[PDB]
PDB file of all heavy atoms in Angstrom:
ATOM      1  N   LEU Q  67      -3.350  22.254  36.232  1.00 50.17           N
ATOM      2  CA  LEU Q  67      -4.431  22.689  35.337  1.00 50.17           C
ATOM      3  C   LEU Q  67      -4.125  22.383  33.867  1.00 50.17           C
ATOM      4  O   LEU Q  67      -4.905  22.733  32.978  1.00 50.17           O
ATOM      5  CB  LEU Q  67      -4.696  24.181  35.494  1.00 50.17           C
ATOM      6  CG  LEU Q  67      -5.169  24.649  36.869  1.00 50.17           C
ATOM      7  CD1 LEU Q  67      -5.303  26.155  36.884  1.00 50.17           C
ATOM      8  CD2 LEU Q  67      -6.488  23.984  37.230  1.00 50.17           C
ATOM      9  N   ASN Q  68      -2.979  21.746  33.635  1.00 50.79           N
ATOM     10  CA  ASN Q  68      -2.484  21.413  32.293  1.00 50.79           C
ATOM     11  C   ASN Q  68      -2.520  22.574  31.292  1.00 50.79           C
ATOM     12  O   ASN Q  68      -2.900  22.406  30.137  1.00 50.79           O
ATOM     13  CB  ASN Q  68      -3.191  20.170  31.737  1.00 50.79           C
ATOM     14  CG  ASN Q  68      -2.270  19.307  30.897  1.00 50.79           C
ATOM     15  OD1 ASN Q  68      -1.659  19.785  29.941  1.00 50.79           O
ATOM     16  ND2 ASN Q  68      -2.146  18.036  31.265  1.00 50.79           N
ATOM     17  N   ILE Q  69      -2.119  23.754  31.754  1.00 49.00           N
ATOM     18  CA  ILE Q  69      -2.100  24.942  30.910  1.00 49.00           C
ATOM     19  C   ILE Q  69      -0.731  25.140  30.268  1.00 49.00           C
ATOM     20  O   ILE Q  69       0.272  25.312  30.962  1.00 49.00           O
ATOM     21  CB  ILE Q  69      -2.470  26.206  31.707  1.00 49.00           C
ATOM     22  CG1 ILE Q  69      -3.956  26.190  32.072  1.00 49.00           C
ATOM     23  CG2 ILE Q  69      -2.126  27.457  30.913  1.00 49.00           C
ATOM     24  CD1 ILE Q  69      -4.255  26.767  33.440  1.00 49.00           C
ATOM     25  N   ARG Q  70      -0.696  25.114  28.940  1.00 44.74           N
ATOM     26  CA  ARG Q  70       0.550  25.290  28.203  1.00 44.74           C
ATOM     27  C   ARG Q  70       0.543  26.591  27.409  1.00 44.74           C
ATOM     28  O   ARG Q  70       1.324  27.503  27.684  1.00 44.74           O
ATOM     29  CB  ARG Q  70       0.790  24.104  27.267  1.00 44.74           C
ATOM     30  N   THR Q  71      -0.344  26.672  26.422  1.00 47.10           N
ATOM     31  CA  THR Q  71      -0.454  27.862  25.586  1.00 47.10           C
ATOM     32  C   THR Q  71      -0.380  29.159  26.385  1.00 47.10           C
ATOM     33  O   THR Q  71      -0.836  29.222  27.527  1.00 47.10           O
ATOM     34  CB  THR Q  71      -1.800  27.904  24.839  1.00 47.10           C
ATOM     35  OG1 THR Q  71      -2.875  27.894  25.786  1.00 47.10           O
ATOM     36  CG2 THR Q  71      -1.934  26.705  23.913  1.00 47.10           C
ATOM     37  N   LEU Q  72       0.196  30.190  25.777  1.00 46.41           N
ATOM     38  CA  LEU Q  72       0.393  31.468  26.452  1.00 46.41           C
ATOM     39  C   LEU Q  72       0.070  32.635  25.525  1.00 46.41           C
ATOM     40  O   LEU Q  72       0.556  32.696  24.396  1.00 46.41           O
ATOM     41  CB  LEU Q  72       1.828  31.587  26.967  1.00 46.41           C
ATOM     42  CG  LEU Q  72       2.116  30.948  28.326  1.00 46.41           C
ATOM     43  CD1 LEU Q  72       3.454  31.424  28.872  1.00 46.41           C
ATOM     44  CD2 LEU Q  72       0.995  31.247  29.310  1.00 46.41           C
ATOM     45  N   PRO Q  73      -0.755  33.559  26.009  1.00 45.18           N
ATOM     46  CA  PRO Q  73      -1.318  33.456  27.359  1.00 45.18           C
ATOM     47  C   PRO Q  73      -2.561  32.572  27.391  1.00 45.18           C
ATOM     48  O   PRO Q  73      -3.145  32.292  26.344  1.00 45.18           O
ATOM     49  CB  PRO Q  73      -1.695  34.902  27.686  1.00 45.18           C
ATOM     50  CG  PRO Q  73      -1.964  35.524  26.359  1.00 45.18           C
ATOM     51  CD  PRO Q  73      -1.001  34.879  25.403  1.00 45.18           C
ATOM     52  N   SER Q  74      -2.954  32.139  28.584  1.00 46.66           N
ATOM     53  CA  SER Q  74      -4.127  31.289  28.743  1.00 46.66           C
ATOM     54  C   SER Q  74      -5.024  31.992  29.734  1.00 46.66           C
ATOM     55  O   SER Q  74      -4.515  32.763  30.548  1.00 46.66           O
ATOM     56  CB  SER Q  74      -3.756  29.905  29.279  1.00 46.66           C
ATOM     57  OG  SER Q  74      -3.245  29.066  28.249  1.00 46.66           O
ATOM     58  N   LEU Q  75      -6.335  31.752  29.660  1.00 45.62           N
ATOM     59  CA  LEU Q  75      -7.247  32.289  30.674  1.00 45.62           C
ATOM     60  C   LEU Q  75      -7.937  31.142  31.393  1.00 45.62           C
ATOM     61  O   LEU Q  75      -8.307  30.154  30.770  1.00 45.62           O
ATOM     62  CB  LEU Q  75      -8.308  33.190  30.054  1.00 45.62           C
ATOM     63  CG  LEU Q  75      -7.844  34.354  29.177  1.00 45.62           C
ATOM     64  CD1 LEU Q  75      -9.040  35.085  28.636  1.00 45.62           C
ATOM     65  CD2 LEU Q  75      -6.937  35.324  29.930  1.00 45.62           C
ATOM     66  N   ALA Q  76      -8.134  31.290  32.699  1.00 45.20           N
ATOM     67  CA  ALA Q  76      -8.804  30.265  33.491  1.00 45.20           C
ATOM     68  C   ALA Q  76      -9.803  30.967  34.391  1.00 45.20           C
ATOM     69  O   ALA Q  76      -9.407  31.802  35.202  1.00 45.20           O
ATOM     70  CB  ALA Q  76      -7.792  29.486  34.322  1.00 45.20           C
ATOM     71  N   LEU Q  77     -11.080  30.648  34.212  1.00 41.47           N
ATOM     72  CA  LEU Q  77     -12.171  31.234  34.987  1.00 41.47           C
ATOM     73  C   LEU Q  77     -12.555  30.267  36.089  1.00 41.47           C
ATOM     74  O   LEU Q  77     -12.792  29.102  35.822  1.00 41.47           O
ATOM     75  CB  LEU Q  77     -13.386  31.508  34.088  1.00 41.47           C
ATOM     76  CG  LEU Q  77     -14.678  31.983  34.766  1.00 41.47           C
ATOM     77  CD1 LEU Q  77     -14.389  33.247  35.551  1.00 41.47           C
ATOM     78  CD2 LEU Q  77     -15.795  32.247  33.747  1.00 41.47           C
ATOM     79  N   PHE Q  78     -12.599  30.759  37.325  1.00 37.83           N
ATOM     80  CA  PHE Q  78     -13.002  29.976  38.483  1.00 37.83           C
ATOM     81  C   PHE Q  78     -14.260  30.582  39.097  1.00 37.83           C
ATOM     82  O   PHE Q  78     -14.381  31.798  39.195  1.00 37.83           O
ATOM     83  CB  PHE Q  78     -11.882  29.967  39.535  1.00 37.83           C
ATOM     84  CG  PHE Q  78     -10.621  29.285  39.080  1.00 37.83           C
ATOM     85  CD1 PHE Q  78      -9.673  29.965  38.326  1.00 37.83           C
ATOM     86  CD2 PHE Q  78     -10.378  27.962  39.416  1.00 37.83           C
ATOM     87  CE1 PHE Q  78      -8.497  29.321  37.902  1.00 37.83           C
ATOM     88  CE2 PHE Q  78      -9.218  27.321  39.007  1.00 37.83           C
ATOM     89  CZ  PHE Q  78      -8.279  28.002  38.240  1.00 37.83           C
ATOM     90  N   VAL Q  79     -15.184  29.718  39.498  1.00 39.08           N
ATOM     91  CA  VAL Q  79     -16.397  30.129  40.190  1.00 39.08           C
ATOM     92  C   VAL Q  79     -16.573  29.181  41.364  1.00 39.08           C
ATOM     93  O   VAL Q  79     -16.475  27.960  41.197  1.00 39.08           O
ATOM     94  CB  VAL Q  79     -17.641  30.051  39.278  1.00 39.08           C
ATOM     95  CG1 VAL Q  79     -18.932  30.244  40.091  1.00 39.08           C
ATOM     96  CG2 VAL Q  79     -17.552  31.068  38.168  1.00 39.08           C
ATOM     97  N   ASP Q  80     -16.824  29.746  42.546  1.00 37.00           N
ATOM     98  CA  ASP Q  80     -16.929  28.961  43.778  1.00 37.00           C
ATOM     99  C   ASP Q  80     -15.666  28.127  44.018  1.00 37.00           C
ATOM    100  O   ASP Q  80     -15.740  26.994  44.508  1.00 37.00           O
ATOM    101  CB  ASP Q  80     -18.184  28.063  43.760  1.00 37.00           C
ATOM    102  CG  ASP Q  80     -19.481  28.860  43.664  1.00 37.00           C
ATOM    103  OD1 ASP Q  80     -19.512  30.022  44.122  1.00 37.00           O
ATOM    104  OD2 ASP Q  80     -20.471  28.321  43.122  1.00 37.00           O
ATOM    105  N   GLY Q  81     -14.514  28.694  43.661  1.00 35.00           N
ATOM    106  CA  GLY Q  81     -13.229  28.032  43.837  1.00 35.00           C
ATOM    107  C   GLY Q  81     -12.993  26.825  42.940  1.00 35.00           C
ATOM    108  O   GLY Q  81     -12.074  26.046  43.175  1.00 35.00           O
ATOM    109  N   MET Q  82     -13.824  26.661  41.910  1.00 38.46           N
ATOM    110  CA  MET Q  82     -13.716  25.511  41.016  1.00 38.46           C
ATOM    111  C   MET Q  82     -13.532  25.950  39.579  1.00 38.46           C
ATOM    112  O   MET Q  82     -14.115  26.944  39.158  1.00 38.46           O
ATOM    113  CB  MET Q  82     -14.959  24.633  41.127  1.00 38.46           C
ATOM    114  CG  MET Q  82     -14.974  23.797  42.394  1.00 38.46           C
ATOM    115  SD  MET Q  82     -16.474  22.846  42.495  1.00 38.46           S
ATOM    116  CE  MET Q  82     -17.639  24.119  43.014  1.00 38.46           C
ATOM    117  N   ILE Q  83     -12.738  25.207  38.820  1.00 37.31           N
ATOM    118  CA  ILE Q  83     -12.491  25.599  37.434  1.00 37.31           C
ATOM    119  C   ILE Q  83     -13.774  25.547  36.602  1.00 37.31           C
ATOM    120  O   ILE Q  83     -14.559  24.591  36.695  1.00 37.31           O
ATOM    121  CB  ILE Q  83     -11.342  24.791  36.783  1.00 37.31           C
ATOM    122  CG1 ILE Q  83     -10.916  25.412  35.453  1.00 37.31           C
ATOM    123  CG2 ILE Q  83     -11.734  23.347  36.576  1.00 37.31           C
ATOM    124  CD1 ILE Q  83     -10.390  26.824  35.586  1.00 37.31           C
ATOM    125  N   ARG Q  84     -14.003  26.609  35.829  1.00 34.81           N
ATOM    126  CA  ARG Q  84     -15.165  26.702  34.954  1.00 34.81           C
ATOM    127  C   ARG Q  84     -14.758  26.416  33.523  1.00 34.81           C
ATOM    128  O   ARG Q  84     -15.316  25.539  32.869  1.00 34.81           O
ATOM    129  CB  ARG Q  84     -15.784  28.096  35.028  1.00 34.81           C
ATOM    130  CG  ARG Q  84     -16.853  28.219  36.070  1.00 34.81           C
ATOM    131  CD  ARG Q  84     -18.036  27.339  35.718  1.00 34.81           C
ATOM    132  NE  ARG Q  84     -18.987  27.295  36.816  1.00 34.81           N
ATOM    133  CZ  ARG Q  84     -20.019  28.122  36.953  1.00 34.81           C
ATOM    134  NH1 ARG Q  84     -20.240  29.066  36.046  1.00 34.81           N
ATOM    135  NH2 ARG Q  84     -20.827  28.000  37.998  1.00 34.81           N
ATOM    136  N   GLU Q  85     -13.770  27.156  33.040  1.00 36.92           N
ATOM    137  CA  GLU Q  85     -13.313  26.973  31.671  1.00 36.92           C
ATOM    138  C   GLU Q  85     -11.880  27.481  31.536  1.00 36.92           C
ATOM    139  O   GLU Q  85     -11.449  28.350  32.300  1.00 36.92           O
ATOM    140  CB  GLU Q  85     -14.256  27.715  30.715  1.00 36.92           C
ATOM    141  CG  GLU Q  85     -14.011  27.460  29.245  1.00 36.92           C
ATOM    142  CD  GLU Q  85     -14.150  26.004  28.892  1.00 36.92           C
ATOM    143  OE1 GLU Q  85     -15.288  25.480  28.950  1.00 36.92           O
ATOM    144  OE2 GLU Q  85     -13.115  25.382  28.571  1.00 36.92           O
ATOM    145  N   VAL Q  86     -11.136  26.920  30.585  1.00 38.44           N
ATOM    146  CA  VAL Q  86      -9.779  27.370  30.304  1.00 38.44           C
ATOM    147  C   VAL Q  86      -9.674  27.697  28.821  1.00 38.44           C
ATOM    148  O   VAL Q  86     -10.066  26.884  27.967  1.00 38.44           O
ATOM    149  CB  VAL Q  86      -8.727  26.307  30.692  1.00 38.44           C
ATOM    150  CG1 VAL Q  86      -7.363  26.678  30.137  1.00 38.44           C
ATOM    151  CG2 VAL Q  86      -8.652  26.166  32.203  1.00 38.44           C
ATOM    152  N   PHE Q  87      -9.189  28.898  28.510  1.00 38.25           N
ATOM    153  CA  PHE Q  87      -9.009  29.292  27.116  1.00 38.25           C
ATOM    154  C   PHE Q  87      -7.524  29.401  26.786  1.00 38.25           C
ATOM    155  O   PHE Q  87      -6.752  30.028  27.514  1.00 38.25           O
ATOM    156  CB  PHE Q  87      -9.725  30.607  26.792  1.00 38.25           C
ATOM    157  CG  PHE Q  87      -9.788  30.897  25.319  1.00 38.25           C
ATOM    158  CD1 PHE Q  87     -10.902  30.522  24.577  1.00 38.25           C
ATOM    159  CD2 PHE Q  87      -8.722  31.499  24.670  1.00 38.25           C
ATOM    160  CE1 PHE Q  87     -10.963  30.763  23.215  1.00 38.25           C
ATOM    161  CE2 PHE Q  87      -8.775  31.740  23.296  1.00 38.25           C
ATOM    162  CZ  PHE Q  87      -9.894  31.374  22.575  1.00 38.25           C
ATOM    163  N   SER Q  88      -7.133  28.780  25.679  1.00 41.81           N
ATOM    164  CA  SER Q  88      -5.744  28.746  25.251  1.00 41.81           C
ATOM    165  C   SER Q  88      -5.502  29.757  24.130  1.00 41.81           C
ATOM    166  O   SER Q  88      -6.026  29.591  23.027  1.00 41.81           O
ATOM    167  CB  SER Q  88      -5.409  27.342  24.740  1.00 41.81           C
ATOM    168  OG  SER Q  88      -5.642  26.366  25.744  1.00 41.81           O
ATOM    169  N   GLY Q  89      -4.720  30.798  24.413  1.00 42.41           N
ATOM    170  CA  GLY Q  89      -4.403  31.806  23.409  1.00 42.41           C
ATOM    171  C   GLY Q  89      -5.063  33.169  23.596  1.00 42.41           C
ATOM    172  O   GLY Q  89      -5.709  33.427  24.618  1.00 42.41           O
ATOM    173  N   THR Q  90      -4.905  34.042  22.601  1.00 43.70           N
ATOM    174  CA  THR Q  90      -5.401  35.417  22.687  1.00 43.70           C
ATOM    175  C   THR Q  90      -6.876  35.583  22.341  1.00 43.70           C
ATOM    176  O   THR Q  90      -7.455  34.787  21.593  1.00 43.70           O
ATOM    177  CB  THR Q  90      -4.612  36.372  21.767  1.00 43.70           C
ATOM    178  OG1 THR Q  90      -4.580  35.843  20.438  1.00 43.70           O
ATOM    179  CG2 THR Q  90      -3.200  36.536  22.267  1.00 43.70           C
ATOM    180  N   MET Q  91      -7.464  36.650  22.877  1.00 44.81           N
ATOM    181  CA  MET Q  91      -8.807  37.063  22.504  1.00 44.81           C
ATOM    182  C   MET Q  91      -8.864  38.580  22.419  1.00 44.81           C
ATOM    183  O   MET Q  91      -8.220  39.279  23.220  1.00 44.81           O
ATOM    184  CB  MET Q  91      -9.829  36.570  23.537  1.00 44.81           C
ATOM    185  CG  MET Q  91     -10.503  35.269  23.161  1.00 44.81           C
ATOM    186  SD  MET Q  91     -11.807  34.834  24.314  1.00 44.81           S
ATOM    187  CE  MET Q  91     -10.870  34.421  25.765  1.00 44.81           C
ATOM    188  N   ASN Q  92      -9.626  39.087  21.452  1.00 48.11           N
ATOM    189  CA  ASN Q  92      -9.946  40.507  21.426  1.00 48.11           C
ATOM    190  C   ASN Q  92     -11.007  40.811  22.483  1.00 48.11           C
ATOM    191  O   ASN Q  92     -11.489  39.896  23.174  1.00 48.11           O
ATOM    192  CB  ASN Q  92     -10.388  40.963  20.030  1.00 48.11           C
ATOM    193  CG  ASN Q  92     -11.589  40.193  19.513  1.00 48.11           C
ATOM    194  OD1 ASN Q  92     -12.399  39.690  20.288  1.00 48.11           O
ATOM    195  ND2 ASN Q  92     -11.708  40.096  18.193  1.00 48.11           N
ATOM    196  N   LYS Q  93     -11.368  42.083  22.619  1.00 48.75           N
ATOM    197  CA  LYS Q  93     -12.249  42.506  23.706  1.00 48.75           C
ATOM    198  C   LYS Q  93     -13.658  41.906  23.604  1.00 48.75           C
ATOM    199  O   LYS Q  93     -14.255  41.517  24.619  1.00 48.75           O
ATOM    200  CB  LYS Q  93     -12.315  44.034  23.748  1.00 48.75           C
ATOM    201  CG  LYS Q  93     -13.018  44.618  24.951  1.00 48.75           C
ATOM    202  CD  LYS Q  93     -13.080  46.136  24.816  1.00 48.75           C
ATOM    203  CE  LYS Q  93     -13.400  46.800  26.143  1.00 48.75           C
ATOM    204  NZ  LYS Q  93     -14.638  46.247  26.748  1.00 48.75           N
ATOM    205  N   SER Q  94     -14.194  41.829  22.386  1.00 47.94           N
ATOM    206  CA  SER Q  94     -15.545  41.283  22.226  1.00 47.94           C
ATOM    207  C   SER Q  94     -15.604  39.774  22.486  1.00 47.94           C
ATOM    208  O   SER Q  94     -16.557  39.283  23.086  1.00 47.94           O
ATOM    209  CB  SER Q  94     -16.159  41.655  20.867  1.00 47.94           C
ATOM    210  OG  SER Q  94     -15.282  41.375  19.796  1.00 47.94           O
ATOM    211  N   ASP Q  95     -14.583  39.040  22.045  1.00 50.24           N
ATOM    212  CA  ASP Q  95     -14.546  37.598  22.283  1.00 50.24           C
ATOM    213  C   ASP Q  95     -14.337  37.300  23.761  1.00 50.24           C
ATOM    214  O   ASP Q  95     -14.892  36.330  24.293  1.00 50.24           O
ATOM    215  CB  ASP Q  95     -13.454  36.929  21.433  1.00 50.24           C
ATOM    216  CG  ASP Q  95     -13.872  36.743  19.975  1.00 50.24           C
ATOM    217  OD1 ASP Q  95     -15.089  36.636  19.698  1.00 50.24           O
ATOM    218  OD2 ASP Q  95     -12.982  36.695  19.088  1.00 50.24           O
ATOM    219  N   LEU Q  96     -13.534  38.136  24.419  1.00 51.55           N
ATOM    220  CA  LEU Q  96     -13.284  38.004  25.849  1.00 51.55           C
ATOM    221  C   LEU Q  96     -14.573  38.214  26.632  1.00 51.55           C
ATOM    222  O   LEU Q  96     -14.910  37.426  27.528  1.00 51.55           O
ATOM    223  CB  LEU Q  96     -12.180  38.980  26.309  1.00 51.55           C
ATOM    224  CG  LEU Q  96     -11.900  38.955  27.820  1.00 51.55           C
ATOM    225  CD1 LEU Q  96     -11.585  37.524  28.267  1.00 51.55           C
ATOM    226  CD2 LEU Q  96     -10.760  39.900  28.214  1.00 51.55           C
ATOM    227  N   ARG Q  97     -15.320  39.258  26.291  1.00 54.64           N
ATOM    228  CA  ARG Q  97     -16.602  39.489  26.970  1.00 54.64           C
ATOM    229  C   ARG Q  97     -17.544  38.299  26.796  1.00 54.64           C
ATOM    230  O   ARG Q  97     -18.156  37.826  27.761  1.00 54.64           O
ATOM    231  CB  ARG Q  97     -17.263  40.783  26.484  1.00 54.64           C
ATOM    232  CG  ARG Q  97     -18.484  41.177  27.331  1.00 54.64           C
ATOM    233  CD  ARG Q  97     -19.317  42.237  26.637  1.00 54.64           C
ATOM    234  NE  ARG Q  97     -18.515  43.391  26.257  1.00 54.64           N
ATOM    235  CZ  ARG Q  97     -18.238  44.409  27.064  1.00 54.64           C
ATOM    236  NH1 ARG Q  97     -18.703  44.415  28.306  1.00 54.64           N
ATOM    237  NH2 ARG Q  97     -17.501  45.423  26.627  1.00 54.64           N
ATOM    238  N   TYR Q  98     -17.659  37.815  25.563  1.00 55.80           N
ATOM    239  CA  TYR Q  98     -18.539  36.686  25.276  1.00 55.80           C
ATOM    240  C   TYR Q  98     -18.101  35.461  26.074  1.00 55.80           C
ATOM    241  O   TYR Q  98     -18.931  34.772  26.666  1.00 55.80           O
ATOM    242  CB  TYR Q  98     -18.536  36.363  23.781  1.00 55.80           C
ATOM    243  CG  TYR Q  98     -19.457  35.228  23.392  1.00 55.80           C
ATOM    244  CD1 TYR Q  98     -20.766  35.475  23.005  1.00 55.80           C
ATOM    245  CD2 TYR Q  98     -19.017  33.906  23.421  1.00 55.80           C
ATOM    246  CE1 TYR Q  98     -21.610  34.439  22.653  1.00 55.80           C
ATOM    247  CE2 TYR Q  98     -19.851  32.865  23.070  1.00 55.80           C
ATOM    248  CZ  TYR Q  98     -21.148  33.135  22.685  1.00 55.80           C
ATOM    249  OH  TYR Q  98     -21.984  32.099  22.335  1.00 55.80           O
ATOM    250  N   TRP Q  99     -16.797  35.193  26.085  1.00 55.02           N
ATOM    251  CA  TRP Q  99     -16.267  34.028  26.789  1.00 55.02           C
ATOM    252  C   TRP Q  99     -16.603  34.088  28.282  1.00 55.02           C
ATOM    253  O   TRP Q  99     -17.078  33.110  28.855  1.00 55.02           O
ATOM    254  CB  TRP Q  99     -14.755  33.910  26.565  1.00 55.02           C
ATOM    255  CG  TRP Q  99     -14.131  32.651  27.119  1.00 55.02           C
ATOM    256  CD1 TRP Q  99     -14.108  31.416  26.535  1.00 55.02           C
ATOM    257  CD2 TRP Q  99     -13.396  32.527  28.347  1.00 55.02           C
ATOM    258  NE1 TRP Q  99     -13.431  30.520  27.338  1.00 55.02           N
ATOM    259  CE2 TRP Q  99     -12.985  31.178  28.454  1.00 55.02           C
ATOM    260  CE3 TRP Q  99     -13.076  33.409  29.369  1.00 55.02           C
ATOM    261  CZ2 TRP Q  99     -12.249  30.705  29.548  1.00 55.02           C
ATOM    262  CZ3 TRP Q  99     -12.352  32.940  30.450  1.00 55.02           C
ATOM    263  CH2 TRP Q  99     -11.944  31.602  30.528  1.00 55.02           C
TER     264      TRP Q  99
END
């Protein structure tokens, strides 16, 4: 998945990658993402 930054988030839908976020998020940015 070529994930380096830590921590990273990876959202999967139907077993397929949707998006990968590199780094931290607060609660509101996380909800939006």
Side-chain angles (χ1 to χ4, degrees), residues 67-69 71-99:
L67 298 177
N68 215 305
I69 289 143
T71 59
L72 276 194
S74 281
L75 306 178
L77 174 57
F78 296 84
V79 170
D80 299 332
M82 284 178 283
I83 192 61
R84 269 295 171 92
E85 188 60 68
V86 169
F87 191 94
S88 302
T90 52
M91 264 186 290
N92 58 27
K93 189 183 197 306
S94 50
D95 282 333
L96 177 55
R97 189 194 306 275
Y98 182 92
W99 187 82

